[PDB]
Enzyme design. Sequence first.
Site, mmCIF file in Angstrom:
data_model
loop_
_atom_site.group_PDB
_atom_site.id
_atom_site.type_symbol
_atom_site.label_atom_id
_atom_site.label_comp_id
_atom_site.label_asym_id
_atom_site.label_seq_id
_atom_site.Cartn_x
_atom_site.Cartn_y
_atom_site.Cartn_z
ATOM 1 N N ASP A 65 0.733 -1.165 0.116
ATOM 2 C CA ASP A 65 0.013 -0.027 -0.072
ATOM 3 C C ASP A 65 0.762 1.292 -0.083
ATOM 4 O O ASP A 65 1.238 1.578 1.165
ATOM 5 C CB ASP A 65 -1.018 0.039 1.385
ATOM 6 C CG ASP A 65 -1.644 1.315 1.395
ATOM 7 O OD1 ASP A 65 -1.886 1.922 0.265
ATOM 8 O OD2 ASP A 65 -2.478 1.501 2.210
ATOM 9 N N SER A 85 -0.656 15.514 -12.207
ATOM 10 C CA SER A 85 -0.926 15.211 -13.442
ATOM 11 C C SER A 85 -1.015 16.351 -14.382
ATOM 12 O O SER A 85 -1.394 17.303 -13.983
ATOM 13 C CB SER A 85 -2.304 13.966 -13.484
ATOM 14 O OG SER A 85 -2.475 13.844 -14.992
#
EC number: 3.4.23.22
Length: 330
Positions: free
Chosen positions: A35, A199
């Site tokens: 994770d 992004s």
Amino acid sequence: STGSATTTPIDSLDDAYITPVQIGTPAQTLNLDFDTGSSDLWVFSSETTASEVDGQTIYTPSKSTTAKLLSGATWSISYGDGSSSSGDVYTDTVSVGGLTVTGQAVESAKKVSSSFTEDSTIDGLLGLAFSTLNTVSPTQQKTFFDNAKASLDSPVFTADLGYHAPGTYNFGFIDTTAYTGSITYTAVSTKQGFWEWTSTGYAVGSGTFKSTSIDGIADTGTTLLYLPATVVSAYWAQVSGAKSSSSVGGYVFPCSATLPSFTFGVGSARIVIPGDYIDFGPISTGSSSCFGGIQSSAGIGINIFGDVALKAAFVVFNGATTPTLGFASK
């Protein structure tokens, strides 16, 4: 040194991925959820409330000759999906795909929440976010990656998650045969303890690319792709019959639909998520309404590039002095 381990989807939907981890002496192998959105290595154990264990493999520290109780140490964690767990702490030897850390903090669960109990396939979590998020008290502990880093050939690990298929976590090296083209690296902020990056935008299907900054985290421990409501609405508008359902808890779509791809930007590069990766199947057994793999982050407070996004790429978690993230197509 290096390590390399196969990671396997837990079910036919790729709801999560498990990777075998050797703990203790002699080795006890548990299947952990790696994770990158958290920083605790915790396991179901011989100490876990019996009624809260239902099919998981347990760590039994009393059977490990290298286990030592970390005196006075406790841990307690709550995840974004509402689940939680807590317990005490041992140090022990932990190995992943041939890479060994001695003195790793292994957080032994005394209590786990129902969703963990109900998932027999996940024996615990192995956190790979920054150690600043580790919950051990009163002395915070380091992640497996943080402990291994200095010994690795290169201070990196890579995630290569499969679509409906196994993949690979590598530590200490970049497998140049595992991706196509080049790896595009992008800046990371560690201020919130995550692999947080920005992004450069998105496209829906064959549509034009929209240049827009989307700050979010690369999180292998989250199943879906959580993005701003505007982006998500634009995606689902291209699917006839798709709608946001308050009762189901997100966007659903007719199971008969063919889903468009979704592209996200990494600098000037582009990662394409095929439409099929966005199908999470019937909302309930036998339903013809299917759950979408792109959902709104509104009210999460952060955008999350979860498995839906990451499995479309070869992803480098670069733990150099100034960390960065790398993405390649594959």
